[PDB]
Design a protein around this ligand. Structure first.
Ligand SMILES: Cc1ncc(CNc2cncc(F)c2)s1
Length: 460
């Protein structure tokens, strides 16, 4: 039975509004309703992995798992295995996988982050799950960010706290946050970004939604505008939105948006908004294709509608050779030529690099680079031809061309990372000098760039 080179992944996010679900929720897992929906001809085909994020979830873990498993069994006639479940307050993540994957999944991690301080600590934050699927690392984040139209900056701060402090994936990747630890990272939830239009325009917005004319609303969506301005979710993707705003509905229908200020809302307006979102970030040149992104129309117990997204994702096999794992494969090497880091720092410490990759026995430290002053007042750190030659554990091009090198540039004075990025080994040529490039981030904000050339030698 061959190992897969692709899987499909279902991502669901639903703010349940503290109400139990209705008896039938299958439309969620079938990607049926509004937006980019799944073809009816696929309804019996199970996804490989289902990741369910809830917010304001009133159920016990046992109660929700029974509903989820019975839903999937009805759709697919498959009894899914529980990979992980983790709950912080009323924020929950469930991961389910086809039984045939049970011995493909390992290194399961869970964690949570509580956002805010004093007043604002006690219900917002994030839960996450990571694991290895054969040779591929997968991370999943469900976050419930700060509410309210005038708190976009708070949401952005919540985002940065979550990516800094959520401890998932390989703890040996010490310089790297969750935005660099996984082949594929999915981040979803009630992100709570709003359509920024004046309150007086509520009925006009409702009109536009009834006409299915979303363009003049999406152009004011705070998540799209903050992402365009590089304030949040730098280097993440989101599918185009083609479904109506998923908040705030009157319960038990979808005919009415409930936007007016009430004592129950803290006298705040809740103009119709795309609160409920799915974004992803995959390593460079890894296959990932969104095959659905939409909302259900028939699940009406909450003031939010459920959101679904599905993906094709590239995966690799747990490779063994005569040599690696447990030795190098002398026939393989990775060389870096003419490399330099450009950093936004004012600091004047010397810097060194760390190269991390599961194609190495352990990470590799470089010599210090040569600092030069750049023409527009930046720091340029030159490595020239001084970088260590990296010795992969396996030389087979079928393995090595699918790998990635994580790079951290660290201060010699403090050993703190000033920037992290990732280089794909999926090159146009071997034994050939080729340009490489990554942006560098720290705490998920842009701090610089790394560029140079690579020369990859495989056994072929
Ligand atoms: C990484 C990014 N590149 C462009 C972005 C903005 N995308 C957008 C879509 N629709 C309506 C808008 F106002 C903006 S985010």
């Amino acid at each position: 039975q061959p190992e897969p080179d692709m899987i499909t992944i279902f991502i669901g996010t639903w703010n349940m509004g503290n109400a139990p679900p209705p008896k039938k929720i299958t439309s969620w897992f079938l990607s049926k309703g509004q937006g980019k929906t799944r073809d009816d001809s696929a309804d019996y085909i199970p996804h490989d992995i289902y990741v369910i994020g809830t917010q304001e979830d009133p159920l016990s873990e046992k109660e929700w798992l029974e509903i989820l498993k019975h839903s999937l069994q009805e759709i697919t006639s498959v009894t899914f295995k529980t990979v992980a479940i983790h709950t912080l307050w009323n924020i929950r993540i469930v991961v389910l996988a086809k039984p045939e994957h049970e011995n493909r999944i390992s290194h399961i991690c869970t964690d949570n982050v509580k956002t805010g301080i004093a007043n604002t600590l006690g219900n917002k934050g994030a839960v996450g799950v990571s694991f290895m699927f054969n040779g591929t690392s997968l991370g999943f984040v469900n976050s419930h960010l700060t509410s309210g139209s005038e708190k976009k900056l708070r949401r952005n701060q919540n985002y940065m706290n979550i990516l800094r402090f959520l401890a998932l994936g390989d703890k040996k990747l010490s310089p790297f946050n969750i935005t660099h630890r996984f082949t594929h990272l999915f981040w979803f939830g009630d992100l709570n970004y709003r359509v920024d239009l004046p309150t007086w325009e509520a009925e006009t917005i409702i009109q536009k939604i009834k006409q299915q004319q979303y363009a003049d609303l999406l152009s004011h969506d705070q998540l799209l505008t903050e992402r365009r301005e590089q304030k949040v979710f730098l280097h993440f993707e989101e599918e185009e939105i083609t479904f109506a705003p998923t908040y705030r509905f009157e319960r038990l229908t979808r005919d009415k948006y409930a936007y007016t200020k009430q004592k129950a809302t803290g006298m705040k307006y809740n103009l119709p908004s795309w609160c409920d979102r799915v974004l992803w970030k995959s390593y460079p040149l890894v296959h990932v294709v969104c095959q659905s992104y939409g909302s259900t129309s028939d699940i009406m117990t909450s003031d939010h509608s459920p959101v679904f997204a599905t993906f094709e994702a590239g995966v690799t096999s747990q490779f063994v050779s005569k040599n690696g794992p447990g030795t190098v494969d002398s026939q393989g090497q990775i060389e870096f030529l003419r490399c330099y880091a450009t950093l936004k720092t004012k600091s004047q410490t010397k810097f060194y690099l760390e190269f991390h990759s599961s194609c190495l026995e352990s990470f590799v430290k470089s010599q210090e680079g040569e600092n030069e002053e750049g023409s527009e007042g930046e720091l340029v750190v030159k490595f020239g031809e001084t970088l260590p030659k990296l010795k992969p554990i396996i030389s087979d091009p079928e393995y090595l061309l699918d790998q990635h090198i994580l790079i951290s540039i660290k201060s010699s004075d403090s050993d703190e990372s000033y920037g992290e990025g990732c280089i794909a080994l999926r090159l146009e040529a071997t034994e050939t000098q080729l340009p490489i490039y990554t942006p560098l981030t720290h705490h998920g904000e842009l701090t610089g760039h790394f560029q140079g050339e690579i020369k990859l030698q495989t056994s072929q």
